[PDB]
Structure 1
């Protein structure tokens, strides 16, 4: 198994475009290794974790309740809404919407949640307000993913995303209950099987969120580690290529095999 940085560089050689990577120690926050750490990449659906961090932060501030039920209508439904499209009559709670956004990548759920906070500009404000002056959300779904043509809109860097994710999952920017809730949602991801999960040994813990565009881009953010406990944050982004989805997925899975085999 190639060394992880060797493998990242090889992935980029085979795919074209750029591959960005970072691995942080969860406890300490130290950067363990990286490639293109400060370069921008489209977030795609990886932003949905950040969105639910902002929602949880409002819960912690007494401004939102996870049990608050949101009714919506057919005209709110956008592409790739596998959970929300099934709840037109009953609606969904805020907590259900975060579960759908994170675990199923549901786009209408993400839009509804963005509305709760006032839109993409307000998510960017949340990020700024937690010390992430890099990451930006500009668009709603489905414009955001299924292709962000490479502007700086809707981008992050590997290090900004990793850093921000660690600040949401550890420390005290969220309460203990909210930090746990966020990681629970990510552990329950159902749509990232072909990625890091494909390389994960029995007994490990992973909490993740993936992203994709039709053409060009892919990504994943994760907290993972052996023995049931996450101990590192890994962020991988891909953009700018003409590679197939199967090729993007395989290269992420192969990067994952390297980082597990060298753990």
Structure 2
């Protein structure tokens, strides 16, 4: 809806920073709205959904098992690792690692999982081979959040991210079981409360993943819809603002409010 476009433009003026936006119909794959769809933005923790997509594709092929247990050292622990810092003794299964990466943005979990697939370059090769030749992961946590202006490392575009998420969730690439697991992790997101979720009417489905980084970078990808079933994918990024995390949060929530209001 145009009113949603106005809210994105609202946000871009008020944050003094580029904002990118895509609305995608889940069923048909048609674009409903867009704003800067071909511009690059830091992915931040929104990459972790793509990461566990690659992991699940390996699980499908039997190159990985969700129940396999990984042990790690205190040295592997980087900034913000709420879950993995609690399992130095017993380790964590691959499933538990994706759960922490996605629901809680656990950075050490993401790095451990990056290791299982061969690193940033192999995630990028994964995306390339499922038809996303735009998104790229280059560094590990926490450095991939640096968000240097016009750096294309660790970036995607709204359009690239939206279509890639569509294919992961509702495409033929992953098994139905793996599709379901990926969306289940996203539905259990615990660190995106003040964003899209804050606009949600009671009884709506939402599966999302948010990100934050340096230089005012903020973002969210989501599959959402009324009546407990997702029907639309939304992708929203911003970078470059000097604004607080809180204002950035409220700006995304306003865009979400327009999205729902004009559904």
Into which bin does the TM-score normalised by the smaller protein fall? over 0.9
Query: What is the DSSP-based 3-state SS (H/G/I as helix, E as strand, rest coil) of the residue aligned with 1:108?
Result: helix
Q: Report the Cα distance in structure 1 between the residues aligned to 2:90 and 2:132, rounded to whole angstroms.
A: 36
Q: Report the Cα distance in structure 1 between the residues aligned to 2:3 and 2:149, rounded to whole angstroms.
A: 31
Residues 16-55 of structure 1, C-alpha deviation per residue, up to 9 Å, x if partnerless?
A: 1100000000011100010001110000000000000000
Q: Which residue in 1 is equivalent to 2:61?
A: 61
Residues 135-189 of structure 1, C-alpha deviation per residue, up to 9 Å, x if partnerless?
A: 0000100111265554000000000000000000012100000000000000000
Task: Point out where structure 2 has 5 or more consecutive residues left out of the alignment.
Answer: none
Alignment CA distance shift 1:146-1:191 (3 Å): farther
Alignment CA distance shift 1:148-1:51 (3 Å): farther
Alignment CA distance shift 1:100-1:262 (3 Å): same
Runs of 4+ more than 3 Å apart? 146-150
Alignment CA distance shift 1:187-1:52 (3 Å): same
Q: Report the Cα distance in structure 2 between the residues aligned to 1:117 and 1:255, rounded to whole angstroms.
A: 35
Alignment CA distance shift 1:245-1:167 (3 Å): same
- After superposition, residues 223-262 of structure 1 pair within 5 angstroms as 223-262=223-262
What is the CA RMSD across the aligned residues, in angstroms?
Answer: 1.2
Does the alignment pair 1:170 with 2:170? yes
Residues 244-263 of structure 1, C-alpha deviation per residue, up to 9 Å, x if partnerless?
A: 11110000000000000000
Question: 1:241 deviation in Å?
Answer: 1.2
Task: Point out where structure 1 has 5 or more consecutive residues left out of the alignment.
Answer: none
CA contact 2:41–2:238 (8 Å) conserved in 1: yes
Alignment CA distance shift 1:146-1:88 (3 Å): farther
Per the normalisation by structure 1, the TM-score is 0.98
